[PDB]
Design a protein around this ligand. Structure first.
Ligand SMILES: CS(=O)(=O)c1ccc(-c2cnc(NCc3cccc4c3CCO4)n3cnnc23)cc1
Length: 350
């Protein structure tokens, strides 16, 4: 990788999220969204390292702080859509062609730390919040499918979550140092998703009833000893990190235990490996993988970018010295974008 460009957003506030749109066809514009301050900005990657500003969304609320964004598409037209959320706890769905807010979802009692769309169903949106819960939304029928939390859910702010390959289960993590598994291919969750598609407020006077999922299907606090701020599935394995200068690769149960045989009472975990690094010991630093899950990237608090080949390289630039909060690879993995605390964006081309 070589650094081919860099820019700074005029708001001068930290950029907390960056996502390439992986739903665009080959030969169609290579676009990424950045979120920071009360802004959402779209950029296009052109040849010779050129980055072109496409559109900006500025929230009507000047005190909003966006923390996350995620791309999806309309299941009937295949047109792209961008979801954004942050400190206000409001999810906004943006039409990226006009950069206008189409619709918004209220409900979390506090900030939203992460948004993720279901890998098979573009209408299923997962949000994770400082209110200790995760919420699953159906953005086609505007329904809250389920709330994951309560008694035996997270006991502190939820920082990240990820669906597995097929979206049969979710792993979440947060300030309580725990990682919890929530199966969404249970008869109860499949029926709730099915019912969310049949719901229409114009044909009934009764509200849609969301499932209250009080119990996870697995839980561990034995991987990290501090806030767990990023979790991702790697097949049936998990990659997760805290502020302890390592990404840990682990699995629930013993070495030969199949993930789908793991009971909620499972007391063991198996550590499979560690990706060690330096100077990334502050809260709120995300790692990311490319589409094919063959590369792993993580920025550190002094503007160094670590890249591992999953099949370590340190990327540095003399002008890049601020914390890199999140990175995103283009779908073909030829471009890696890094966003920083000083509102700077760095483009690295392979
Ligand atoms: C520069 S400062 O003023 O010291 C500062 C630093 C961090 C935050 C902050 C960032 N991000 C989130 N949530 C998203 C999130 C969650 C997990 C991992 C992760 C991210 C974004 C990158 O990595 N926050 C929720 N509450 N505060 C924050 C706010 C101010």
């Amino acid at each position: 990788f070589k650094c081919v460009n860099s820019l700074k957003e005029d708001h001068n506030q930290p950029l907390f999220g960056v996502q390439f749109n992986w739903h665009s066809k080959e030969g169609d514009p290579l676009v990424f969204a950045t979120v920071g301050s009360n802004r959402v900005t779209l950029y296009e990657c052109h040849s010779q390292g050129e980055i072109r500003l496409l559109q900006s969304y500025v929230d009507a609320d000047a005190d909003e702080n966006f923390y996350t964004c995620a791309w999806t598409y309309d299941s009937n037209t295949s047109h792209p859509l961008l979801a954004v959320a942050g400190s206000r706890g409001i999810i906004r769905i943006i039409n990226p062609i006009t950069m206008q807010c189409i619709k918004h979802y209220v409900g979390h009692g506090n900030a939203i730390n992460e948004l993720k769309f279901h890998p098979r169903d573009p209408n299923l949106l997962l949000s994770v919040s400082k209110d200790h819960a995760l919420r699953l939304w159906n953005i086609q029928t505007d329904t809250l499918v389920a709330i994951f939390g309560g008694v035996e859910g997270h006991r502190d702010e939820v920082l990240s979550a990820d669906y597995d390959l097929l979206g049969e289960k979710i792993m979440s993590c947060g300030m309580d140092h725990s990682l919890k598994l929530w199966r969404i291919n249970s008869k109860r969750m499949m029926n709730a998703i099915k019912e969310s598609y049949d719901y229409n407020p114009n044909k009934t006077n009764r509200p849609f009833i969301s499932q209250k999922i009080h119990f996870p299907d697995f839980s561990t606090r034995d991987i990290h000893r501090n806030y767990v701020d990023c979790v991702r599935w790697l097949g049936d394995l998990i990659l997760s990190k805290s502020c302890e200068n390592a990404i840990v690769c682990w699995k629930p149960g013993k070495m030969e235990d199949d993930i789908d045989k793991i009971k909620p009472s499972e007391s063991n975990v198996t550590i499979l490996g560690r990706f060690d690094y330096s100077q990334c010991d502050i809260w709120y630093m995300r790692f990311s993988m490319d589409f094919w899950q063959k590369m792993l990237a993580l920025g550190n608090q002094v503007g160094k970018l670590y890249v591992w080949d999953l099949e370590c390289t340190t990327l540095t630039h003399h002008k890049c010295g601020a914390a890199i909060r999140q990175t995103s690879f283009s779908r073909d993995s030829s471009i890696l974008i890094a966003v920083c605390d000083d509102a700077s964006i760095w483009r690295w081309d392979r």
